Amino acid sequence: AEIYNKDGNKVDLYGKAVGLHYFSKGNGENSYGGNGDMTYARLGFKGETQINSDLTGYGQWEYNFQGNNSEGAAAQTGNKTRLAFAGLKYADVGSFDYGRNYGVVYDALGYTDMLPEFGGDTAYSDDFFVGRVGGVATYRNSNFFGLVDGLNFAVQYLGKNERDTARRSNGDGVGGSISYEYEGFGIVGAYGAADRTNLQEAQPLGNGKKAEQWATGLKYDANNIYLAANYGETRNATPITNKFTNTSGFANKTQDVLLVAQYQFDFGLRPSIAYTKSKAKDVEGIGDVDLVNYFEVGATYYFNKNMSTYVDYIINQIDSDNKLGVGSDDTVAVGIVYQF
Amino acid sequence: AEIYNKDGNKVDLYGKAVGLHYFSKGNGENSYGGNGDMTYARLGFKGETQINSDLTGYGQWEYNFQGNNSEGAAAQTGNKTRLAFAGLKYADVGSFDYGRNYGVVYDALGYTDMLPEFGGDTAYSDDFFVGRVGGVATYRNSNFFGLVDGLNFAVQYLGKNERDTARRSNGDGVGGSISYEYEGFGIVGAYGAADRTNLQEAQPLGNGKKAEQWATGLKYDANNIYLAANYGETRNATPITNKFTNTSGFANKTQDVLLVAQYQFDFGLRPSIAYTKSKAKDVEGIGDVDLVNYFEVGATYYFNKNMSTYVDYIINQIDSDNKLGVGSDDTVAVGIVYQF
Amino acid sequence: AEIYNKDGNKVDLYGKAVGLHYFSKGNGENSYGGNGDMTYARLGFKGETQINSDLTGYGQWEYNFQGNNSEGAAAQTGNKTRLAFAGLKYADVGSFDYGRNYGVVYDALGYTDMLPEFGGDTAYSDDFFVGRVGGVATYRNSNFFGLVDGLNFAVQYLGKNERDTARRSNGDGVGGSISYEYEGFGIVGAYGAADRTNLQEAQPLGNGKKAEQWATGLKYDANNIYLAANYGETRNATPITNKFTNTSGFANKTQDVLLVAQYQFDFGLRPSIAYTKSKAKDVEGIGDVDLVNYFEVGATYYFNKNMSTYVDYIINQIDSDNKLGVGSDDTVAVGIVYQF
Structure with missing residues (x-):
């Protein structure tokens, strides 16, 4: 959200509170995504000043606050800066x-x-x-x-x-x-x-x-x-x-x-079909082994620019004897997003 | 403070800088509250968008930054997310x-x-x-x-x-x-x-x-x-x-x-009298033992919505032989609060 | 940036994204400043409410987010609260x-x-x-x-x-x-x-x-x-x-x-010449040894209040046999700053 815009400088203060839960089976690490509560939040700023008509300066910082830790000693787990940079843009x-x-x-x-x-x-x-x-x-x-x-x-x-x-x-x-x-x-x-x-x-x-x-x-x-x-x-x-x-x-x-492949219905829905495979070759000791292999089906409903919900389903193709230990179970993820 | 309100979305950016010090005796852990500097700050956002007249989306994130650590390696102690959630509200x-x-x-x-x-x-x-x-x-x-x-x-x-x-x-x-x-x-x-x-x-x-x-x-x-x-x-x-x-x-x-019991004088003062007891029964090995037991007397003076000061005094009733080790000393706490 | 000002309360939300890199030689700890990427960001708030014409309350919190950690387990290194306090100002x-x-x-x-x-x-x-x-x-x-x-x-x-x-x-x-x-x-x-x-x-x-x-x-x-x-x-x-x-x-x-000694050219440039020496005397075992000793030359170019760039060069005078191990190499630092 653009919270500041005066005298050539414009600041965007942005973030999101994502209530998210993943479903797998197991203990959830023969699964793709793991399992349980995975709620988190994000906070960032995006600045941009106009030094003159040809010259622009900008900076950005974005952080990630996990939302599934306790308030004990492990509170910080998963917390970090994703982005932190500054730069200049000159005409063409x-x-x-x-x-x-x-x-x-x-x-x-x-x-x-x-x-x-x-x-x-x-x-x-x-x-x-x-x-x-x-x-x-x-x-x-x-x-x-x-x-x-x-x-x-x-x-x-x-x-x-x-x-x-x-x-x-x-x-x-x-x-x-x-x-x-x-x-x-x-x-x-x-x-x-x-x-x-x-x-x-x-x-x-x-x-x-x-x-x-x-x-x-x-x-x-x-x-x-x-x-x-x-x-x-x-x-x-x-x-x-x-x-x-x-x-x-x-x-x-x-x-x-x-x-x-995705399609954006005008009433808010965005179905998604996707396919991914990644395989490592000549692995000392193992030979050719897949790392990632799955089909994915999912949908996002956008209530507006600020609110949305989604389901993401991984039909994991990795097979069970995978010689590196890569887990083979599907994961389903359901999330509710508020962003500004 | 409501820093953003446009196109159905309204964002509240909020926080507080609390200068706070506790007084006890000891080394301060026969005391109730412990002892010394306990300054901290809080930062959070509260968002709310109007998807239509019946439907509302909202999210909230709130963090706690301790203010009594050094800037060494223990800097983060006590730091955590209190709240992080998103949700929808539909008409009745x-x-x-x-x-x-x-x-x-x-x-x-x-x-x-x-x-x-x-x-x-x-x-x-x-x-x-x-x-x-x-x-x-x-x-x-x-x-x-x-x-x-x-x-x-x-x-x-x-x-x-x-x-x-x-x-x-x-x-x-x-x-x-x-x-x-x-x-x-x-x-x-x-x-x-x-x-x-x-x-x-x-x-x-x-x-x-x-x-x-x-x-x-x-x-x-x-x-x-x-x-x-x-x-x-x-x-x-x-x-x-x-x-x-x-x-x-x-x-x-x-x-x-x-x-x-509290009373709110119209000039800003809020005296508080309180009483608390909590006792655990059938404790393997100990029997019936109090965990919490005290009288409390205290006051908050509100200069306005943004500024206030307070004293909080715990007349600890826990007694000295408490069979779990629960400390028995009073603690007094004095704090000065800026919030927005 | 003053993002809020209503009803006696005024809030300033401030911060900076500093892209910064230091050059030394070595492994960089016979150097002054060390060596490599040292990017970071800062976030803070400065609040001030007018309780009446003579009386003011204020609070401040400022944090430091390192920008040169990975997103693994060492993510937080260097992260801390610099300032966190609240107070009152009364007429004279x-x-x-x-x-x-x-x-x-x-x-x-x-x-x-x-x-x-x-x-x-x-x-x-x-x-x-x-x-x-x-x-x-x-x-x-x-x-x-x-x-x-x-x-x-x-x-x-x-x-x-x-x-x-x-x-x-x-x-x-x-x-x-x-x-x-x-x-x-x-x-x-x-x-x-x-x-x-x-x-x-x-x-x-x-x-x-x-x-x-x-x-x-x-x-x-x-x-x-x-x-x-x-x-x-x-x-x-x-x-x-x-x-x-x-x-x-x-x-x-x-x-x-x-x-x-510094001078502020009106077109943006601020050359800086500086000199520093600090020496410890009567060090058990060592005697008189310098801790800090150098000349410094450097410049900041201000594109405006929001953007600027700088170079800072330490001509380290510490000598090589320094009996405490204080490193003796120069360090050069180049930085690009966006602040709001």
Whole structure:
């Protein structure tokens, strides 16, 4: 909600209180989504000042407050900053911004990252360029310097983040994305590569000195319809865990596919059919094993811009003997959303 | 403070900076309230959109930021989300909401939960239905479908929350409250029962498979006067610790009583006299022992809606040989409040 | 940004998204500032209600959200409340406020605490009176009861805070500051002393029962120029660590000096030259050793009140054999700031 707009500066204060519960069977970790209460809230600000007609500055911070902890010592679990960055936008030369933000390959992966609750499975956090990272400098240009409507690109520089954990670290890397949109059609390509930190290299799973990820995207988004497809591959980047052994590291390679079809009824309903498969190849010891494999069916009802409800059902195709331990049970999720 | 109100949506952004200090003697844990600096702040949002004349959506999130930690590693201590839920309200059919919220038995207990700083001792957090819980679905109806002015009720479904700690877990349970108000008189009844988790059952104190709590309330709240009385009992639900032994668990039974009398002078002052006793019966090993027992005297001066000050004095009646280790010293608390 | 102003109450909701990166060499801890991504955000509220023409109430809370953590388990690192207090201001009698706030000696030290990114090195957090503390009651008077324009003073009472850590605890202490300003000239004196807690006394470095700190300040701040000098000394208060041995405690004495010169071009640029030295004397085992010693050069460009950029360069004078392990490398820091 735009709570401030004066003298060139305009501030948007935003957030949401999401009452959400997941249903599975088990103890719920042969399931996809797990099980039980998963309520949470979000708070953020989006600022934008007009330094002059050509020049704009902006900043953004967004936090996540879990809503299913007790008020004891574990109160904070799951709490974190998703985004925190500032930057400048100059006439048609481009925008530049620095901070904790979405990696460039997410430029592609975001196409199919639209289910009511699940989806976007290959867009992991703190994972080189596919999801939200820390320390990235991102240059983005639109319509090629104002000369070609609809043709955009970006380059992104990723700084080393030697973290406690091999799962959330990264060496320096570079990535870029090119994308073209026209009359409801959108096509994208993204690619980044990086150095892996020493601790990454010590993990029993995956061998290599460099982290690569790329992804392609195609989409039709007009006339209330939304059809979208992503296809991408990664070398030494996706984190995997062998639950039997408890070993962990990165998949040597992954081939990933995501398809999404949605329709927006004018009375509020948005049915969604989606399909996702991601499989790791040449896993030291295991061979070819699926990480993610499912059909998804779901609906969002929008009462208005502020209120909505949804159900998201994962028909999990992962099978039961999965040699990494990936759980095979469906999960259903029901949520009620207030946002401003 | 209502910072946003446009197009059917209205947002209230609220909070308080409470400078507060408690005085006891000791080392301050033969005391009631403990001792020293206890400053804190609160931040929350309350949203409400009008989907149409009969239908309303709403959400709420409220957080607690301790103000007496250092800026080292213990900085976060005491930090948590009190509330986080969203829901819908439909004409006279009722409201429904899901999330982290007040349990139904608090519907009664809130009557006497009005001291300047202390009080509400039996309304514990994460304790089945008496204080704020996680995972509750709550249906509330007012004036019996619009047919009986002043007669209200609610049912509440509580989902299992298998937490790390027996103190903050719960199995599934159900509760309800009925209440009638008329010309300043208010009467209430509340009751919930639940399954106890396995870990609850492993604790050395208390034996049983089910958690019950009920409470009754009576109140006169008109003409600047506030008189209120609560009486309730609980079976296997109230958490107790044996400080000598260090054992812990739930009281087999408790009988609880709370009385409150306050008066609101028109120039700002609100004297408060209150009395509270809560006693656990049949404690494995101990027998009948008081948990809470005191007189309270105190005053709030309201400079206006935004500013106020208060003193709260607990004349602790707990005696010195208390066989559970419950501390017996008075505590005095002085606070200065800014809220918006 | 003033988001609320009605009926005597006015609320300011404020914050900043700071994209910031430090450059050093090493592994970056022979450096001054360390090295890598150091992005963060800040959020706070400042409230003020008018109880009547003479009487005002106010409160403030400000938090710090790190922006360089991953979204794993270390997500919260560096997160804390800087300020949290409430108070009253009465006509010319004075203001009084209680809570987590700046200690009185910071009244002086703030003169030179103006570099773009570094500086204010002797203003430590949770360190008796020089930086932000918890539990202080502060009385401040301006223009001596309205009788002497420009002559101000304050007294401050500091309560014992027995914390886990000797570094962040304190016994009770008292401090005051007197200060005079006139036509761009400002002069200040501040002094506080305190008892040290038992755990403080157990540390291998520093011997004594009392913590003292004082500081003096001189400043010219008019006509776009800013020249400022601080000189202060402390007995048993400044925390020091012997990195070779890993011992830790407080410097027996320190003599501290800080000088700052800045100029504000009307087109936005603010060059800064600064110099800082702080040295501990009579260190059990070491003798006289510098803690802080450097030249600093830097610039801030202000696009407007909301946006700005800066570079801050520390020409570290600490030498390489420093007998406490204090690192000797320069650090450069580049930041981009959005604030509202």
